[PDB]
Design a protein around this ligand. Sequence first.
Ligand code: B12
Ligand code: B12
Ligand SMILES: CC[C@H]1O[C@@H](n2cnc3c(N)ncnc32)[C@H](O)[C@@H]1O
Ligand SMILES: CC[C@H]1O[C@@H](n2cnc3c(N)ncnc32)[C@H](O)[C@@H]1O
Ligand SMILES: [Ca+2]
Ligand SMILES: [Ca+2]
Ligand SMILES: [K+]
Ligand SMILES: [K+]
Lengths: 135, 136, 553, 552, 178, 178
Amino acid sequence: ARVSDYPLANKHPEWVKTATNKTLDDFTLENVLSNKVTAQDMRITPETLRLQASIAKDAGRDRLAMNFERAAELTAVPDDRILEIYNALRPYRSTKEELLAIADDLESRYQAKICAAFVREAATLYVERKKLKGD
Amino acid sequence: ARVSDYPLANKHPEWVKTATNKTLDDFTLENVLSNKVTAQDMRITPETLRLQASIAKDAGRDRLAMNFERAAELTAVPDDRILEIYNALRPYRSTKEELLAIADDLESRYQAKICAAFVREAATLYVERKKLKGDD
Amino acid sequence: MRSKRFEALAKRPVNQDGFVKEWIEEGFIAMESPNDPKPSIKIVNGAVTELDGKPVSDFDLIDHFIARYGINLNRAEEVMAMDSVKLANMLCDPNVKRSEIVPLTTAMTPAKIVEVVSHMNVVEMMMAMQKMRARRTPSQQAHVTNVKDNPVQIAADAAEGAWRGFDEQETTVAVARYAPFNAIALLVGSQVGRPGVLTQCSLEEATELKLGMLGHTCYAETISVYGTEPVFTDGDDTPWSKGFLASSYASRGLKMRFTSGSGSEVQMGYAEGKSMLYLEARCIYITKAAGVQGLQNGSVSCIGVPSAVPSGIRAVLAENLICSSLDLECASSNDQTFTHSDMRRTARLLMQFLPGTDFISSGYSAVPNYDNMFAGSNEDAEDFDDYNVIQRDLKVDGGLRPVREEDVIAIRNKAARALQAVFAGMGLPPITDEEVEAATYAHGSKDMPERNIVEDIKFAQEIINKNRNGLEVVKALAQGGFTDVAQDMLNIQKAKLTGDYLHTSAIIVGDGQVLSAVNDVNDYAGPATGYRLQGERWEEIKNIPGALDPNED
Amino acid sequence: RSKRFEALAKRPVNQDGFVKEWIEEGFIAMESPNDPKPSIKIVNGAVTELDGKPVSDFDLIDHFIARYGINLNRAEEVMAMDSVKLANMLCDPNVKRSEIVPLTTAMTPAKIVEVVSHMNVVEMMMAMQKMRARRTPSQQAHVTNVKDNPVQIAADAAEGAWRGFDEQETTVAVARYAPFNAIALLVGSQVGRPGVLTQCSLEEATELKLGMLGHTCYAETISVYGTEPVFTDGDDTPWSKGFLASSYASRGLKMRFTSGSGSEVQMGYAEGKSMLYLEARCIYITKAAGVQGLQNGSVSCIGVPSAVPSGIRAVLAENLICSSLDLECASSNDQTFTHSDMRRTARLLMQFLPGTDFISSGYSAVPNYDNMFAGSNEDAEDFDDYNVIQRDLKVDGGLRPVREEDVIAIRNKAARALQAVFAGMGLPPITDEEVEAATYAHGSKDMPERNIVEDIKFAQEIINKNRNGLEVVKALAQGGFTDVAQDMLNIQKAKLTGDYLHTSAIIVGDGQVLSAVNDVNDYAGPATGYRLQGERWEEIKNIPGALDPNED
Amino acid sequence: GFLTEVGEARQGTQQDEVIIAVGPAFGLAQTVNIVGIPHKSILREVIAGIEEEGIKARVIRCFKSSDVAFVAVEGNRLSGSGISIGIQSKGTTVIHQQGLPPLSNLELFPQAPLLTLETYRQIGKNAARYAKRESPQPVPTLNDQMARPKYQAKSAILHIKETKYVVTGKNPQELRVA
Amino acid sequence: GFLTEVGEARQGTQQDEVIIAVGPAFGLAQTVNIVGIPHKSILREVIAGIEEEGIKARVIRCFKSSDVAFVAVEGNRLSGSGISIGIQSKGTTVIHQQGLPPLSNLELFPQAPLLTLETYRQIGKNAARYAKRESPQPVPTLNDQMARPKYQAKSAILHIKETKYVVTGKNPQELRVA
Ligand code: B12
Ligand code: B12
Ligand SMILES: CC[C@H]1O[C@@H](n2cnc3c(N)ncnc32)[C@H](O)[C@@H]1O
Ligand SMILES: CC[C@H]1O[C@@H](n2cnc3c(N)ncnc32)[C@H](O)[C@@H]1O
Ligand SMILES: [Ca+2]
Ligand SMILES: [Ca+2]
Ligand SMILES: [K+]
Ligand SMILES: [K+]
């Protein structure tokens, strides 16, 4: 996808699905009132986030794109787990092995390769800068 | 004179005379208290105004220069006559020939040749635009 | 005897402000400090080995984050070698396009870009800002709060704010557990005034994200970053925990930005002897390095620190310019009181208002300042007419418009009624017709009947405790007779699914049409180019109240 | 009724005057569809067509501008250049001022209006800091009071000079007071800082007579207008004003014209044209006459452009046209127009941020209740706000913070010097009690009353007996003020050299003339041109209330 | 409707009267001054002040211009005492005297918003006292520096509307006041 | 000269006490708070507010940090009830509890200029009521929006000076008060 394809809601609404594989046009007030759709398919998909990442790159914003790529992986991580991982990246909360185990969980359970690498990098530099538990 | 000669007070104070042929150096407090100089000596010369016109040209200000060249001519015109001529150029004060008479006076009596042309121009266009005496 | 001239001067409001002389050694200096590091970078392939005089073995977590993620390494060594005065010249040169500059400015180190803008006066910074701002059209963000957390008033104030032209609106609470009601009331009220307005509820960082997973907010902003490792650690965070939290928001389809601001580090006493502007640049590169799309900066709540020292307000403009030059959306503060003087706060506002930023204020108070739960903004609701007159005087689009009183009465009334049906359709404590009337004609919370806070608190908690989501709000609107408001609410949630508005400077205008720095790129190239106030927008800003028509004169 | 709109209705700005545009009658600040398309026709050294008008249809203003007002060397070349391109060059930091002035002086009035009309106020301010004639910006003050009390005038003038004003302006409530106001202002100014130029604004003929007596240094309120009916109803023509201008220079007196947007439509004779176009005509009259500078920016008609859209932007545009035509610009900010502090600060910042030759042409150095020009946009009670903003933004607004004991000492010396002048000239005495009151006054509410009748009789005798400025010098040298007397003589000596007749000239240091000739603005972008730095910066930094960290 | 033209105004010959000269739209297209004071009450107070001093008041309408000074010059050229009062529709007032230059005057009132009915009565009193060759203290008005900013644009609109009733070369008409 | 260290502060073993933890410069390099209230009076009010609720007040000086949060964290680690009060030299005060995250608190007073001796005494009461496992109403303070920007610069100066007395890796010292 390029900047010509932006915005998706106007150029390609048929390209946007939901985390329960419903299309975008299903989001009419009729389907809401019948409980034919409810809160959980109101969740952005990793495919959508990777399309925006591609568009961010075409617009010359590599870092924004990488943020979107991390976001695409984290759609698979439950709400409570997200907050647990965030809290553990805070200084003096974790040892180095705990952070490495967190990245292991991210990779092996949620296919979150970019977020795992990001967490392992943190673990390495928290050693260098003494931001680990017990420091 | 060029911009390098500006200001005259710093670069050429010896060039600066007064209309009564006094120098800048004469204007000390001792001469003022003794009345060896008076207010009638405190008048800029046509030479000084013409040096300043030449400096304005070097600085790219042609119209400023022309105003200075007219002012150099008007230094020789007495105070009351200056006011008389200003009043005559105001609308509906003068006929065409009084303006031309003023222009003739400026040229022949005070050598004010730029001002004469300036006034003759006024006389001509005051006819075209109905600004003379008896036109309102 | 005392001079009566100086007595009169001693009574002036400006002399109640706080001023101090510079303390260079401790970093109590806005900018241009002799302690700031000389620009330097060592690259070739892969990674950085020296950043602004610091070797890689000496990097703190911030140097690492910036070195690995924050600099366009493709051009760093080329732009490091360019003369800083020439680079400043290009910034404000109208014939060097934004798209030619961004590769270079993103390639400078923090000390390089600080050195570059330090050669500029405020006129030059303003000239550069109107080119470097990411979104072509400028906009505005408002605070919508009241001292009682009255949800009916928040909805009506949000509708008026949206009707005046605010494209983002922000709320917070006096009482912590009111927050779910504030978020819902702000969101409903905003969509009533103009569908597409984005809403946030600023809370503690974990509680804010939970409200976003429920669907009651659109964006988040108060995630803070800091410019020295000690201050960042004393904030109980690292760049990696902030970056992970940033991608967490995007993963839930929520636009977010960071908040920083000059003066935060010296206030904590750990500026490491550096100037406020140098430390703020570090914050901006942290934001860029995290992949966050924009930043709320311009000292913000620390404004009393740079405003006390020489060149402090110029420095605040400089940090806004650095933010935009780094291709980030800039929400340029003007959201906190700092002076007793109207002249002084106008001059500070004008720095961003005249060029335009993505959000001229990141918190214009849409309520009277006594109701402002961020402890007061640089502008409040009583300045609206002045703000509109200056727009008309200068032909400057400052994001707002004049409005008719009866239109605002009609839109506040509808917003109050819309929220009354939401509270009915979700089983929340009732909104009485008396509260609807009062919020329609209110100026602030002084005009509103008191509510049962203890009962309101209990039901608002039960919204997060039972995971009651934004689709229940849509249903209640559809069923209380507000199907037009219900569809707009569904369009807002549908925008979260597309991710279009996660992009730089994104807002939603018209009928669900996203407007961001992707499709509304700033293309300024001098006079008669870029954004010009003209056409129907100009006619809207022209039509201020009190403008007598000659045909009735 | 909405309490929100009640609160807004109580706001001071809602007491200002606003009207919708009336295009047909010229009640529009700029960008009118009625303004002429630029055009020029040159046949053998003379203009035969100007901005759509043939020479047979010229009015006196067209004739004056066509014959003296336009650089005909490049007029046809610049007429064919794209107006946006030219507006781009105006605010481009890499196009030198000396490259632009040949082009702007070759533009017709409609051409330059069209050019600047492409600019927003940020672009206009960016052009102003390059196009301003003098490198260093400056400030001019009003020094008046409701009683024409000469002791208070001298004291306020000394304070104004000490705060940094380089030109100071007075006028009278009672017309026959004028000689006393002129002398008091001149003596007071020289005491606060030798070199400050003074003027006393009166009817045109009376003002030139005062200048011939040596009691003033310059004149400014000589008006020009943008349509022939309005000019005629002012009882003048361009030739009578051009002659008056050269008369001032022939006596060694600096002078400038005054104009301002709104004057023509206020008289009802805008001829369907916008305020900005008519002011451009006023500016070209000034250029054509050879006058070095112009007081413009609406001035006393400020309530006319400020009532209509883009009016204040238009005020900035006219200042920018003035400087672009290589004229000194005294950019107004000298008249009240709004009840709102925010609105009048925005209006001041248009000139204060880039800097003009005189950021204001009349900052009130007295409280506005004493302002005999009916109130300025800024007055004495704004002094501390003005210095804080210089410090906040690192902008040189031409003023500086001052110590109370220093102002007390300089107001005392000035009141005592005028006491010696009044004694040596046989004028109604100035008592020590009047000196004490003038020393500590805020305004005339703090001064003992004088016998206005006796004062009037003796001030008239100064004119009727042709009593000149040299007698003032003699009175100072003989009453214990030789130092003040020498400074007054040096001021009179400046009229002999003609150095301060040039564009933007002021007198700084020890009689050093500083003008656009030797202090040429050389702006070429950031870190070039004038920059606030060094000792001037340390001066502006040191506001009252700035606590030192070692104190704390 | 309270003013009737009775023919071209005659030349006064006795130092006996003061001429009130009003603009071409006074009492017709405009019936109140800038702040809503009726033209009928304005004229009545000025006439009352003149007659209170034992002097006759003669009202004329000028058509050649709408500038208050030139309206007053037309008045003082016909006035038997050489004294006239010029009043524009929006309220601006001048006391003028035959022999003075057109733009000079005895007293000028250049802020119409600051005139009250009492001020207009004093204006008539002073004018008659000028006609009796006395030197009265100029009429005082209240001071208000915001009056000019607040009313300048409305003043210009009202002046443009009166200017539409100018007629070139039409002599002044004597008026009969109800 | 009213504070005196008396050795390393012991950890309280019974739920009998509230610890008042003061900053490094408290009552030494600075003797008044941001608005002139003497440190001695501040200490006496907080102490008395605690003891009026039947709870002993122990005072310690912290050294590892000048941050009011971490000063009170050191306090509540040694408080037998787990309740501590952190007080900086410039006057910022926080009521903390062991087990709360370091940047959380029971009650925070982040505008030292708006604090009176009334508030300081009331802070002592509420801390002891927290130690007695009661749920007191939060301490009410005055409100002034101008207070933050008016004093932020001076508080930064005072904080910087107090930070000069931080000594790494030094445990709190108990103090005796006069
Ligand atoms: C704006 C203004 C002008 C404007 C508009 C005049 C117009 N006729 O429309 C301009 C710049 C064109 C102007 C020109 C002149 N003005 Co003028 N003007 C003012 C000013 C600053 C404000 C008046 C105002 O806005 N009042 C508020 C409005 C709402 O009330 P208003 O009653 O409608 O005001 C009208 C009158 O004031 C009238 N007016 C303005 N100036 C003059 C001058 C004379 C002689 C007359 C009869 C009327 C007049 O114009 C206003 C609108 O129409 C006053 C000073 C003051 N602050 O009062 C000087 C002032 C009234 N002007 C004065 C003078 C001297 C002149 C000129 C002769 C100057 C000149 N040599 O060109 C001309 C006369 C032109 C003319 N035929 O009327 C003097 C009058 C002195 C006197 N007692 O005789 C004043 C008092 C200034 C002063 N410092 O002495 N003026
Ligand atoms: C400026 C400010 C900051 C600044 C400077 C803080 C500092 N220590 O120097 C910055 C941006 C760095 C900051 C950071 C934080 N702040 Co803060 N801060 C403010 C603010 C807006 C104004 C305080 C002020 O200027 N007062 C005027 C001065 C003259 O009085 P003062 O007594 O000297 O003020 C000092 C204290 O307020 C202290 N302080 C400031 N923030 C915080 C937060 C905590 C937990 C503590 C213990 C102390 C503290 O710093 C000031 C001077 O050093 C207040 C809002 C408010 N209502 O006042 C929030 C506020 C006090 N901060 C708050 C928070 C949440 C934080 C952070 C935890 C945010 C974060 N997650 O990073 C950190 C904690 C930093 C720390 N280790 O203390 C909350 C406190 C909530 C609570 N009851 O615990 C407040 C009330 C904002 C809010 N509306 O929620 N803050
Ligand atoms: C109470 C600190 C909080 O206030 C906000 N804030 C205001 N100003 C600043 C600032 N200058 N730097 C960082 N954060 C700031 C931000 O949300 C932060 O978490
Ligand atoms: C009372 C008219 C006088 O006021 C001065 N003045 C103020 N504003 C303007 C203006 N806008 N145009 C011309 N002259 C002006 C000028 O000295 C003129 O003679
Ligand atoms: Ca905000
Ligand atoms: Ca002036
Ligand atoms: K910062
Ligand atoms: K004009």
